Design an enzyme around this catalytic site. Structure first.
Site, PDB file in Angstrom:
ATOM      1  N   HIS A   1       0.843  -1.187   0.000  1.00  0.00           N
ATOM      2  CA  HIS A   1       0.000   0.000   0.000  1.00  0.00           C
ATOM      3  C   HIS A   1       0.880   1.239   0.000  1.00  0.00           C
ATOM      4  CE1 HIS A   1      -2.730   3.155   1.446  1.00  0.00           C
ATOM      5  NE2 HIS A   1      -3.711   2.407   0.980  1.00  0.00           N
TER       6      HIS A   1
ATOM      7  N   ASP B   1       1.394  -8.163   5.824  1.00  0.00           N
ATOM      8  CA  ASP B   1       0.405  -7.095   5.951  1.00  0.00           C
ATOM      9  C   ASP B   1      -0.970  -7.708   5.696  1.00  0.00           C
ATOM     10  OD1 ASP B   1      -1.308  -4.769   5.739  1.00  0.00           O
ATOM     11  OD2 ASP B   1       0.245  -3.613   4.774  1.00  0.00           O
TER      12      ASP B   1
ATOM     13  N   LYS C   1     -11.132  -2.541   8.580  1.00  0.00           N
ATOM     14  CA  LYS C   1     -11.864  -3.322   7.573  1.00  0.00           C
ATOM     15  C   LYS C   1     -11.932  -4.783   7.904  1.00  0.00           C
ATOM     16  CE  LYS C   1      -7.894  -1.856   5.138  1.00  0.00           C
ATOM     17  NZ  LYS C   1      -7.864  -0.895   4.043  1.00  0.00           N
TER      18      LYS C   1
END
Ligand SMILES: *Cc1c(COP(=O)(O)O)cnc(C)c1O
Ligand SMILES: *Cc1c(COP(=O)(O)O)cnc(C)c1O
Lengths: 749, 749, 187
Positions: free
Chosen positions: A263, A354, A392
Site C-alpha cells: 500500500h 500485511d 476493515k
C-alpha cells in the site's frame, strides 16, 4: 447493566405459555422484567429454534422438557434446541422448565441434555422470586463473563470513575455542555462515547505504552485467541502499524525485500526506515487483476540475483530483512503463508505479513496454514509479524490495528526492545474506544464464536456467487452477463473446501500462468465480478462496459463497489453486511443490464457525472459512452501499457529515504509530463484504483521504454473529453489555471 | 434534527404565562412540541435572565414586550434579556411577543431592541400554526447554521448514507449485532458513534489526505477562527502532530534548536528526523517547578556558542532550524511568543510552538501576542508552527490535534510539499469522529462564543484561588496551609489583566531569578498549589507533607491532581469541569489538614498503598510517613541533586538517530545503575512526574559529576522501604526476580 | 412529508401477522408509525393482492417469502404479488420478509422475484430501528422521486419560502386572516 438490554428466550408449550392453568413461567418473566430484562416469549419449539439460531446476543434460554417422550420428540426437541443454541456463544446458560418429573428418566440422551443445561427450574415446587433471582444471577454472571477484560474494566470505569475531578480535557463529556455547537455534538455522539474517551489516564485501566493494568490482559488474551506469543494493539492506524514493525526492525543501510503490491503506507515506512529496498513485482493476467507472486523469487538464488540488481547501493549479501507481502491482496488472493515460510525462512529473519483484509484468517478451517500466525513455529528463527487492519473486515473501530508476533529460533528480542520503538509511533492518549473496540473484535472471535461467524459470511457470498450465475439460466442467448470469476465447477453453495478453491496450476479460469503447488486459495467473500468487454482470448471485444459507469450506476442507486482492475468490478462482501444484501446487489445489477440495452441518456440515470455536469453529455447514451471509452484503452494501447508499466523494473536512482530529503531541500520542482524521460521522480505516484505503486520516490525514468505515459495521457483526455471521471491517479499534481486541466509531477533537479 | 433536543425559552408575564385569558403563547408552545421542540417556560423576566445566561444551547428566545414603560422597565427588561442572551451564541433568534402595540413607540432604545430581535410575534393577530411554523423555521435555520461544515456534512451523512452496501468494515455498526460481545459493545457505545466511523470513505464528506470535500472547508475555517493561513487536522495524536512538522521540516544532518522541557514525543520526532540537536536547559526555582527559558539564549551569539558546543557533529554555522519550545509549560508559564519572534526570527526559519496545554490561547484578550498564531506576521520569514493538543484543555476527542501554519518572508513552500509529508504519518481511515470533534472544538470558539467561555473558567479558577487563600483568614496561628503560588496582590477575582499576572522581573513570589521584560504571564487556570515543607528561604523546614500522600488522599476520595515539582501539588482546572468543582477540591483539601494533624494510620484513609499493602505500614501514621520521607530527600541530597541533574549538559556522545539504531542492532544490553559512569545511554529516561527528559538516547555520563544517581537510588529505597509509591521514573527497566526490586537501564556496549 | 399520508402495505402469514411468537414485523410497523407512516396490514396473500391492485398510492410493500415452496406456491404467491404491484407505479420499492433462509434457493423464478425486490428484510437477524429506518429511507426516496420537477420545487417552496417578506399580494395566505369574510375563505 444499566445498558445491555439482552433478552432471555422463553420456550414453553402453547397450552402452557401465554395461556392459563398454572403460570409461574409468566411470573418468572415478570420478575425478570422487574430486574430489567427483556423477554422473547415463544409458544412452540421450532419457533424458538429460529430465534435462538439467529445471531442474537441471548442471555438465557428457558426450555420446556418432559423427558420420556423421545418418539414424541419432546426431550429430543429440547436437545435440538440446546444444540442449535450453543454454536455462536456456548456459555449462555440454558435452563429447562417443568412442573413434574422432568429429566428423571432420560434414557440415553445425556451428553447434550443433562450436560449443557445449567440447572432445572421446577417452576411449581421452587422459589418464585428467588427462582427468577437465580435465573438473573446466572444471566448477569454470564453477561459479566462474556465481556473481554479491557472492555469490562472500561465499562466499570464509566460508572465509578474518578469522582469529581479528572482534570485534563473534557473530563467525561462535561465541556460539551458549554455551547450550542458542543451540545449538538453531545446529543449526536451519545453520552457513553464522550464519557469514555479519557485524554490521559493511568490508574485502574492501564496505560497502553506501559503495558499495565487490564490492557496487558487484553493483549496476551488476544494472543490466545489469534495465536501468538505476544500481541500489541496499535491505534494510530495500520499506516502506523506497518511503521512500528518496520521501525523496530532495521532502520539503516541494510537491504529489505519488499513486494510491489504494497500500500502507500509501506513505502512511507521505508522512508522512515532509511533502507534501500529490493522489489518482486508479481505477474498479472490480461484483465487488470493484480496477480500473485512467484515463490521461485523466494529461494536463496533469486534474491541473491536481486542483490546485484540494486543499481545505487549494493549491499554485501545481507540476510535480507523484513519481508513484506500483502497477504490476501485486494481481490482475494490469500497466499500460503506456510509456503512463504518454507521457501523464505533461511534468508529472511523477520517476516511481515500485511494481513490487511486478511483479518478473519485465524478463525476458520479454510485458511489453515495460510495466515502468518498459523505456521507451526520451527527452529530457524523467522519472526513473522502480522500487522492486521481490523477496521476493515473483522470489525473494530477506525484506525484499530493489532500486531501479532510469534518468536522462534535465534531472535526473540521482544521483551523491552520492541516497546522502546512501539512508543515512538503511538500517541500518549490511551484508555479509550479504539483500544476497547480492538478487544471486542478479538472477543467476537473467542473460539467457535467467530468460526461460525465468517462461516455465515460465506453463506452470504457463496449464495451470492450462486444466485448471480443463476441468472445465466435465464435469457442468455449467446453470452451477455457479468462474468463472475468462478465460472467453473464451484458455482453454488456446496462446500467450503481448501482444495477446490485453490487456483489450479497453469489453469485457465484465472490466467496467471504457472501457478505453483497449492498456493493461492481464493477468498470466497471477495467476489471478483468481471464486466464483459475484455476477452480471455487475449484482447478486447467490442461489447465493453466501462469500469466507472457500472459503479456510477449503483453509486446513485446507493451501492459502493471497489474498482481495481480495468473492467474488474470487485464487490467486497464483509462481516458488516445485513443478512440479505446480496439481493440488493443482484437487483441493482439486473437493473444495470436493463438500462444499458435501453441505453438511456446518462442524465436520466447518472446525476453524478451527467445531470450535474449538464454540458458535455446532453442527450448522450451510455452505450456509446461505453463504446468510445471501450476503444479509448485500445487506440492508445493503454491496456497493453498496463501490462508494460507493471512488468518493468524502474531505474532505481535514489533510495526513498534520499528521494524524500530532496523535497524539504527544494529540489522538488514542477516537471510536466512531456520531458519526464530522464529525471528522477521524488513523489509516490500510485494509479488508484487499478493497482500498485508504479513509481516510488526514486524511480528514475530511463527513456520511452518507461512506457507509463500511455496512461498519464490517457487520464488527461479522459477528464478532458468527458467530465468527472478517472482522473484518479493519486499523486498527480493538477495545477488549475490556463491550460485544459494539464498535469504535472514532482522530480529532482 | 432527529436528535438535537435544544429547547426554546419562553418568557412572558406571570398574569399571561402558565395562566388564562388569551393563550396563544401556550399554543405556540404546543405546536412547537408537535414539531418536536423542548420548552423552557418562565413566568417572569429575571427568572429568564438566569436560564438564558447559563451555558445552554438555546434555539430561540420569546420575550414579552410592551414598549412605552421604560420607567416601568419592561422594554428595559426586554433589552436586558436580549443583551444577556447574545453573549455566547449571538445568532440565536430572539423573538418578542405582544397582543397590542408593542414596539411602535420605542423612544431611544433601538440599537439593541429593534436591532437584535429577529421578528415580532403578535400572538393574537398573526397566524397561529404558521406562526409557530415561522418560529420553527428560524429555529432550525439557526440550528443548521450553528453546526460547522464538516460536522454538518457528517450528520447529514448518517441519515442519507450509501444506501445498502458500503463495503469495507462494520458498515454503519452492522457487524456489531453478530455476537453477544459485539452487541454489548453496540449498546454501550450508542448507535451514532458506530454509524459514523467509516473505515474508508471518499465521496461526499471528503478524504483527509486529499484535502477535499467539506474537510477543506473545516480546515481554512479553522484558519479564520484560530488565525492562520492554512491549518491541518492531524488525528494520530500530538505525538504525531509534532512528528509531522518535524518531518516535513529538516530530516538530515542539519542542526536543530530544541529546548529541554520537551515531551517524550519531541525527542522521538528527532529520531525520525535524524538530526543533531542543540539544547537550551531552563533554570528552575528551589521548589521543583520547571522554570522558564532565558531569552538571552535566543540572540545571534548564544546559539552560535551552542554550535561549537556540539561535541559529536559540529555543523558549519547553519541557519539553525525548527525551534521547539513548550509554550505554556505544565504549570502555566505562557511565554511571550512575540518575544520569541523578535529575539529569534533572524537565525531560525521555522518556529514550532508545542502549544499543548496552550490550546485556548487564541480566544482571549489576555494571551494577546502570546500565542504563536498571534504574532503580526513580519517580513523576515519565521514559519511559526503551532501544534495544538486539543484533547486536553480545548475539548476535542482523544488524539485530535490541529496544526496551525502562517507564512511570511522567504519560505512559503506549503502548497503541496507539506501534503506529501503530511500523508506519511496519518492513517488512511478518514471521515470520522476525531476529525469531526476537532471541528467542533474549533467551532465552540467562533468569535465571542469561546472568549466568553474561557472567561468562565477563570471565574472558576480565580474564584478558587480566592477561596483557597480565603481559608487563611480562619485559624492560621503562625503558618499552616498549602501555599498557593499567588500569595501577593492578586488574591481574589478582581480582574484578568495582562500586566498584573506577569511575573515581575527579579521578584520573589516565583523564584526564577532575572526574569526578562514582560515575558512569562502565568496562566490563571493552572493553579500551582505548593504544599508546605520547602521554604522560600533556601532549604527544607521540618513540617513537610510528601507529594504522593496529599494526592493519594484525594485519590481515594476521588480527585486527580497533577504532580510535577517536588512538593508542587499542581491542580489543573480546565474547560471540562462542572460549575462548582472548586468546592469539592476545597473540601477535600480542608479534609486533608483535618486528617493530618490527627495523623491517622494510613490504612484508615489510604487503601491505595496501605490497606491493600497491609504489611509495611500497619499502624503507621501519615505524619512520620511524611517526616521520614520529608527527610529522605535531605539525607540523600536529592533535592540538591534536582538542581544538579537538570543544570548539567549531559555529554552528547551519540545523536538520538544513531543512539536508536544501536537498539535493533543488539548493542542495547542490561547495564545496572552502579557502573553507569562512562557508558552512553541509548534509552530515553524521563523522571515523570517531576520534569523533563533528563537523559536522551545518546547522553553519555562522564563521571560522578553526572549526579543523577542520587535520585535513581532514591527511587529504589522509596519503593523498598515503603510499598507502591514513587518508583515512577519512566524508562527504568525493572527486572523482577532475585534482588530486592533492583533496576537496570539500557546503554551501548 | 408533513402531508403525504401514503401507506405501506404489509403482507405476512396469518400465523405470523397480527399474532405472536416472533414479532418484529409489528415492530417495523410501529417504528414506521413513529416516522409518521400509515400501515395497511394484511393477514394473507390474496387479501393483499387486492389492496395492492386497487389504485392506491402505495409507498412500500412488505411480502412474506420462503423460497422453496413453489408447488406450495409461496414464492409463486410472492411473484404474483410483485407482478400485480408494479403495473401502475413500478418504482414502488417492494421488500420481502423472512426469518430464515428466504430466497437462497430460488429455482428459476428470478426475472421478477430477485429482480424487482429492492432488498430483503431478514426481520430477526437485522437491525430493527435501523431496519425500519432503511425502509423509511427507500419509502421517502421513492416518495420524493415520484413527484414531478415543478411540483417538487413548489412543495419545497411552501416549507422554506422567502422568510419574512414576500411583498405583493396576500403573501402566503396572510391577508385572509384580516376579516371574517376572508377567514371564512381561508378555512
Ligand atoms: C486499507 C489498507 C490499509 C489501511 O490502513 P490504515 O492505516 O488503517 O488506514 C493498510 N494497509 C493495507 C495494505 C490496506 O489495504
Ligand atoms: C500531554 C502532551 C501531549 C499529548 O500528546 P498526544 O500525542 O496527543 O498524546 C503532547 N505534547 C505535550 C507537550 C504534552 O504535554
Amino acid at each position: 447493566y444499566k445498558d445491555l438490554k439482552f433478552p432471555v428466550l422463553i420456550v414453553h408449550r402453547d397450552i402452557k405459555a401465554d395461556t392459563v392453568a398454572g403460570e409461574r413461567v409468566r411470573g418468572i418473566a415478570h420478575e425478570l422484567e422487574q430486574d430489567g430484562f427483556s423477554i422473547l416469549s415463544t409458544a412452540s419449539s421450532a419457533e424458538g429454534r429460529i430465534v435462538a439460531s439467529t445471531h442474537h446476543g441471548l442471555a438465557c434460554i428457558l426450555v420446556a422438557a418432559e423427558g420420556a417422550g423421545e418418539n414424541q420428540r419432546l426431550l429430543q426437541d429440547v436437545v435440538e434446541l440446546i444444540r442449535v443454541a450453543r454454536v455462536r456463544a456456548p456459555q449462555l446458560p440454558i435452563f429447562a422448565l417443568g412442573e413434574q418429573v422432568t429429566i428423571e428418566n432420560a434414557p440415553a440422551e445425556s451428553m447434550a441434555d443433562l450436560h449443557q443445561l445449567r440447572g432445572i427450574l421446577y417452576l411449581f415446587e421452587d422459589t418464585v422470586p428467588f427462582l427468577a433471582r437465580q435465573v438473573a444471577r446466572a444471566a448477569r454472571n454470564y453477561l459479566a463473563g462474556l465481556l473481554p477484560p479491557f472492555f469490562r474494566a472500561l465499562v466499570e470505569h464509566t460508572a465509578q470513575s474518578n469522582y469529581s475531578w479528572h482534570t485534563p480535557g473534557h473530563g467525561g463529556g462535561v465541556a460539551y455542555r458549554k455551547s450550542p455547537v458542543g451540545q449538538a455534538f453531545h446529543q449526536f455522539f451519545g453520552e457513553n462515547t464522550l464519557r469514555s474517551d479519557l485524554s490521559v489516564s493511568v490508574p485502574e485501566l492501564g496505560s497502553l505504552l506501559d503495558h499495565t493494568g487490564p490492557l496487558a490482559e487484553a493483549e496476551d488474551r488476544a494472543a490466545r485467541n489469534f495465536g501468538a506469543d505476544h500481541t500489541f494493539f496499535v491505534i494510530n492506524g495500520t499506516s502506523t502499524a506497518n511503521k512500528i514493525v518496520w521501525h523496530s526492525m532495521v532502520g539503516r543501510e541494510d537491504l529489505v525485500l519488499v513486494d510491489r503490491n504494497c500500500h502507500k503506507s509501506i513505502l512511507h515506512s521505508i522512508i522512515m526506515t532509511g533502507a534501500i529496498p529490493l522489489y518482486l513485482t508479481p505477474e498479472r493476467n490480461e484483465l487488470g487483476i493484480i496477480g500473485p507472486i512467484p515463490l521461485s523469487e523466494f529461494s536463496k538464488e533469486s534474491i541473491a540475483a536481486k542483490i546485484a540488481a540494486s543499481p545505487l547501493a549494493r549491499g554485501r549479501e545481507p540476510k535480507v530483512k523484513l519481508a513484506v507481502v500483502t497477504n490476501s491482496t485486494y481481490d482475494g488472493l490469500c497466499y500460503n503463508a506456510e509456503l512463504i515460510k518454507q521457501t523464505l525462512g533461511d534468508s529472511v529473519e523477520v517476516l511481515h505479513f500485511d494481513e490487511a483484509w486478511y483479518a478473519y484468517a485465524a478463525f476458520h478451517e479454510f485458511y489453515d496454514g495460510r495466515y502468518g500466525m498459523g505456521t507451526s513455529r520451527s527452529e530457524e528463527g523467522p519472526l513473522v509479524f502480522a500487522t492486521h487492519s481490523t477496521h476493515k473486515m473483522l470489525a473494530a473501530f477506525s484506525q484499530a490495528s493489532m500486531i501479532h508476533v510469534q518468536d522462534g529460533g535465534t531472535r526473540k528480542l521482544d521483551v523491552a526492545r520492541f516497546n522502546e520503538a512501539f512508543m515512538m509511533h503511538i500517541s500518549t492518549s490511551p484508555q479509550y474506544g479504539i483500544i476497547a473496540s480492538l478487544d471486542v473484535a478479538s472477543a467476537m472471535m473467542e473460539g467457535p464464536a467467530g468460526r461460525s461467524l465468517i462461516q455465515e459470511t460465506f453463506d452470504e457470498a457463496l449464495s451470492f456467487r450462486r444466485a448471480l450465475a443463476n441468472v445465466r439460466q435465464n435469457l442468455d442467448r449467446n453470452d451477455w452477463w457479468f462474468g463472475v470469476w468462478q465460472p467453473e465447477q464451484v458455482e453454488g453453495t456446496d462446500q467450503v473446501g481448501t482444495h477446490d478453491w485453490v487456483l489450479e496450476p497453469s489453469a485457465d479460469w484465472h490466467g496467471f500462468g504457472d501457478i505453483a503447488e497449492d498456493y493461492v486459495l481464493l477468498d470466497p467473500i471477495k467476489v471478483t465480478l468481471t464486466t464483459p468487454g475484455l476477452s480471455a482470448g487475449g484482447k478486447l471485444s467490442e461489447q465493453g462496459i466501462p469500469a466507472a459507469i457500472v459503479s456510477r450506476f449503483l453509486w446513485e442507486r446507493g451501492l459502493v463497489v471497489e474498482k481495481t482492475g480495468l473492467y474488474s468490478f470487485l464487490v467486497l462482501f464483509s462481516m458488516g453486511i445485513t443478512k440479505g444484501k446480496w439481493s440488493t446487489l443482484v437487483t441493482e445489477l439486473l437493473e444495470f443490464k436493463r438500462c444499458y440495452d435501453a441505453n438511456l441518456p446518462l442524465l436520466d440515470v447518472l446525476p453524478s457525472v451527467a445531470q450535474a455536469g449538464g454540458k458535455r453529455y446532453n442527450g448522450v447514451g451510455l452505450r456509446d459512452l461505453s463504446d468510445a471509452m471501450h476503444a479509448s484503452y485500445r487506440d492508445n494501447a493503454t491496456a497493453k501499457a498496463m501490462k508494460r508499466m507493471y512488468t518493468v523494473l524502474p531505474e532505481v536512482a535514489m533510495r526513498p529515504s534520499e528521494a524524500y530529503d530532496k523535497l524539504v531541500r527544494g529540489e522538488v520542482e514542477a516537471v510536466p509530463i512531456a520531458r519526464l524521460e530522464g529525471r528522477i521522480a521524488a513523489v509516490m505516484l500510485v494509479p488508484y484504483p487499478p493497482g500498485i505503486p508504479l513509481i516510488m520516490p526514486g524511480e528514475r525514468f530511463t527513456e520511452a521504454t518507461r512506457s507509463i505515459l500511455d496512461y498519464l495521457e490517457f487520464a488527461r483526455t479522459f477528464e478532458r473529453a468527458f467530465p468527472g471521471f478517472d482522473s484518479d491517479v493519486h499523486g498527480l499534481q493538477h495545477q488549475d489555471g490556463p491550460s485544459g486541466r494539464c498535469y504535472t509531477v514532482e522530480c529532482i533537479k
